[PDB]
Design a protein around this nucleic acid. Structure first.
Lengths: 25, 226, 63, 127, 97
RNA sequence: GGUGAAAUUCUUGGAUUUAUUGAAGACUAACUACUGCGAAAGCAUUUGCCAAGGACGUUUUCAUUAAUCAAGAACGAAAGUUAGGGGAUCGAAGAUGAUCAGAUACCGUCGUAGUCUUAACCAUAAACUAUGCCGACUAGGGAUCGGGUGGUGUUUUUUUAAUGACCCACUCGGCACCUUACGAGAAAUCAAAGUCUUUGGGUUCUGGGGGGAGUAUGGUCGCAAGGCUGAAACUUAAAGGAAUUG
RNA sequence: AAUUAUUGCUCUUCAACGAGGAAUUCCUAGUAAGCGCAAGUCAUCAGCUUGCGUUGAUUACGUCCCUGCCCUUUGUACACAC
RNA sequence: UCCGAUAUAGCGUAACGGCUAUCACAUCACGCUUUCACCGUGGAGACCGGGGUUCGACUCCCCGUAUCGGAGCCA
């Protein structure tokens, strides 16, 4: 529900897509 | 709560009041009633020297008790034991204080509180911190309800009060200054100077505290107790 | 044994959490013109005389 | 004509302290708390427990030589509630009956000039 | 929708109020939004003045009182049989009872 | 000691408590307000120094030098980051005692980072009055803050004066408040959210049903955390606002 | 038709119960309480019920303290309505 | 080998030689809540073992049992 934790959840996934992508470039 | 202690000794009877002796506190000469109270201490044993443990006690007593009359009812006075001999141990001035309920009565809203302190020393090498408190008052025939001060009267009032306290201490060593607070004469002087700035009711000055002392001067103390 | 006979002039009303205490403005029989309020347990009418072991306990008033 | 002590009644919540000392305050007489007279671990601050504790202080005063007392009522103070506990009044109430003479009742609750911080967090104590 | 014109508080022209702590739960609350109530009772109590005065040296000297100012948060104030709730019309009333 | 009740915990090695001191760091109570200052964030102990600011008074001076603003720039709560100092309280994390069917939550006791400071980043907030700035006009009323004007007014100096504080009247500027609706609005409400179909005073920014989505990608800034800019595919007939009765 | 005695009568047998703990029911005047009678169900069987009469107190003449319910205010993202 | 310490309901725990021994938890029942939790009311459960002292031992002395700590070793 809470938009505070969907912002937090997305930010933690921003880290993952940014860290898994560094393995290529 | 009674049967709750689990362990009383980390490792694993004689009544003490029969071993104690009673004295009587003597107030300085600048007080109406020399009789103050009564204390306790063990006998002067071969190692403890119970006269020594009784040397530095500090007792606080109301000024109404010392002066008899109940006008000076709040006015807490602290007396410090300086010399003991012949079971009439002698005490000297140690500081004056206000009762909490008196201080809280004066502080009411819709009026300005003014405070002022100085660190002026006396002629007998005593060092004190005089505190002064005052409250703005609503002049007669006033309509508005608060009557605050304009934050420049306060600076002028605080400058006037600080100047008065320093001058009124230099020259008064211990005795006349103690006999200056008892008859409430300093505050009457404060009102006279500040009556041209702002009304300022309730100029009961404040508590006073000692900071440091010179050499004992045993003869000076004996000059008070006759 | 100080015993005071006091005669009531007014029944203020019931009081207490469970409504078992009555408030009464009661005058003293002797030394008239000095009165007191006293909690009363049982039923009382106007101009009834009471017995006291304390004369000047002022019961609290709900006002 | 009177031997005067200082009551120094400290009645916080969860307990109540009453212990009379000498005028100088360095020699104490018969310190008994509210948790010494009842075994509940919950009625330590109760008015009944303080009533029993006050009588013991007053009783032991007679055999020592204290016939009058100066009352100094105290709350926890500091950053805590600063209000007297439930047993503060009963302790003062009870010792008057034993025969001690009262004088110069005064509140000695320590009050700060906006001191450090109060425990509980920003959102208080959630209940 | 807006429920109050002041909306909780007395902040018009400050922007910040330097909050104080509640007395029951110790919750942060701005000073203006606080619900300050003053409690000034006698030290002993209203009905106990005999037993202290009956056994009192310095007869009827002052019988002094205790002064302290209490701050509650809105949650603690409502729960404590205080300003609890008023109807929509009576919410506008500001005068004390 | 703590709690609704407890327990973890400290205690005959003297805990809690009382008294006399000493140290450290933080904070600035009560006074404290429908009160003040600041562009906002914000700012509450005394004093000294430095520079700054509004309003008022003005028969002083200049003379249209102005309003709003892409780009660009200064400041920017808390949290967070880098490096020293400090590190008392409280205390994300963590450890424990409970409660619970479970409780890595609420509650209790500890407790690092942090909380304070110096130098440097960050550039965010329900950063809200959810109400851009400037200008003019439209109903009354009292209160208050600052400045000014007048009154043989009151009080105190040396009865007396100039003063200081008050009282009355007026005026400028300000934080606000009360009543009403010619007026507005969907209403709640609003002296502006009024002078808008009888539609045009000047100007900047932003929105175009709801999700996907402030997401993906590309730039740019940042030590990092992240900030700014910012879709499409796809999916849907409702989401949403204010009030009424239950 | 009575055997797990339908009930009535006689004799003998003569058990807990020494006034009842935490709780909880009913009750304001002929009311409570004591006592019995008629009817109901019945071929037989009242320790039940519906009514009736005899004797017949104390304590209130109030309160919202506990419990239950009603009204108002209040919040709502419920309307098949917690 | 010596010295010292420990040994009570299903768990923990304290003992005055004038009592086959209190408690909180676990349960037996009855309670109070729409219901589930908290809370209340009366029991059953116990002294490591064996001897001696004693008008009267859980409790005072001796031995053994199991555990723990510290000390020393010419068959």
């Amino acid at each position: 529900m809470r938009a505070k934790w969907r912002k937090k959840r997305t930010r933690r996934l921003k880290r993952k897509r940014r860290k898994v992508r560094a393995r290529s470039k | 709560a009674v049967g709750k202690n689990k362990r009383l000794s980390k490792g694993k009877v004689v009544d003490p009041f029969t071993r104690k002796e009673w004295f009587d506190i003597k107030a300085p000469s600048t007080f109406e009633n020399r009789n103050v109270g009564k204390t306790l201490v063990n006998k002067s044993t071969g190692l403890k020297s119970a006269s020594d443990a009784l040397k530095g006690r500090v007792v606080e007593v109301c000024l109404a008790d010392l002066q008899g009359s109940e006008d000076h009812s709040f006015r807490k006075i602290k007396l410090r034991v300086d010399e003991v001999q012949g079971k009439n141990l002698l005490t000297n001035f140690h500081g004056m204080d206000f009762t909490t309920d008196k201080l809280r009565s004066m502080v009411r809203k819709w009026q300005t509180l003014i405070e002022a302190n100085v660190t002026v020393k006396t002629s007998d090498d005593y060092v004190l911190r005089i505190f002064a408190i005052a409250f703005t008052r609503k002049q007669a025939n006033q309509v508005k309800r608060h009557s605050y001060a304009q934050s420049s009267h306060i600076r002028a009032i605080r400058k006037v009060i600080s100047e008065i306290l320093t001058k009124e201490v230099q020259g008064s060593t211990l005795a006349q200054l103690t006999s200056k607070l008892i008859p409430e004469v300093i505050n009457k002087e404060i009102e006279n100077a500040t009556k041209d700035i702002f009304p300022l009711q309730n100029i009961h000055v404040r508590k006073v505290k000692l900071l440091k002392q010179p050499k004992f001067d045993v003869g000076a103390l004996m000059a008070l107790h006759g | 044994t100080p015993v005071t006979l006091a005669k009531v002039i007014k029944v203020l009303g019931r009081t207490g959490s469970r409504g078992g205490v009555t408030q009464v403005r009661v005058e003293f029989l002797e030394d008239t013109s000095r009165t007191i309020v006293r909690n009363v347990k049982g039923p009382v009418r106007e101009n009834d005389i009471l017995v006291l072991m304390e004369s000047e306990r002022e019961a609290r008033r709900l006002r | 004509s009177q031997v005067f002590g200082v009551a120094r009644i400290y009645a916080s919540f969860n307990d109540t302290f009453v212990h009379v000392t000498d005028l100088s305050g360095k020699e104490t007489i018969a310190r008994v708390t509210g948790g010494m007279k009842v075994k509940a671990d919950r009625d330590e601050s109760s008015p009944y427990a303080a009533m029993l504790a006050a009588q013991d202080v007053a009783a032991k005063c007679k055999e020592v030589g204290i016939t009058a007392v100066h009352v100094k009522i105290r709350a926890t103070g500091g950053t805590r509630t600063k209000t007297p506990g439930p047993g503060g009044q009963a302790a003062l109430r009870a010792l008057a009956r034993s025969g001690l003479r009262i004088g110069r009742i005064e509140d000695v609750t320590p009050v700060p000039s906006d001191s450090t911080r109060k425990k509980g967090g920003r959102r208080g104590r959630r209940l | 929708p807006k429920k109050r014109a002041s909306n909780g508080r007395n902040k018009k022209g400050r922007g910040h109020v330097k909050p104080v702590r509640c007395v029951n739960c110790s919750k942060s609350i701005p000073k203006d939004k606080a619900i300050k109530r003053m409690a000034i009772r006698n030290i002993v109590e209203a009905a106990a003045v005999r037993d202290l005065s009956e056994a009192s040296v310095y007869p009827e000297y002052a019988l002094p009182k205790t002064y302290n100012k209490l701050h509650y948060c809105v949650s603690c104030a409502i729960h404590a049989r205080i300003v609890r709730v008023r109807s929509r019309e009576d919410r506008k009333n500001r005068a004390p009872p």
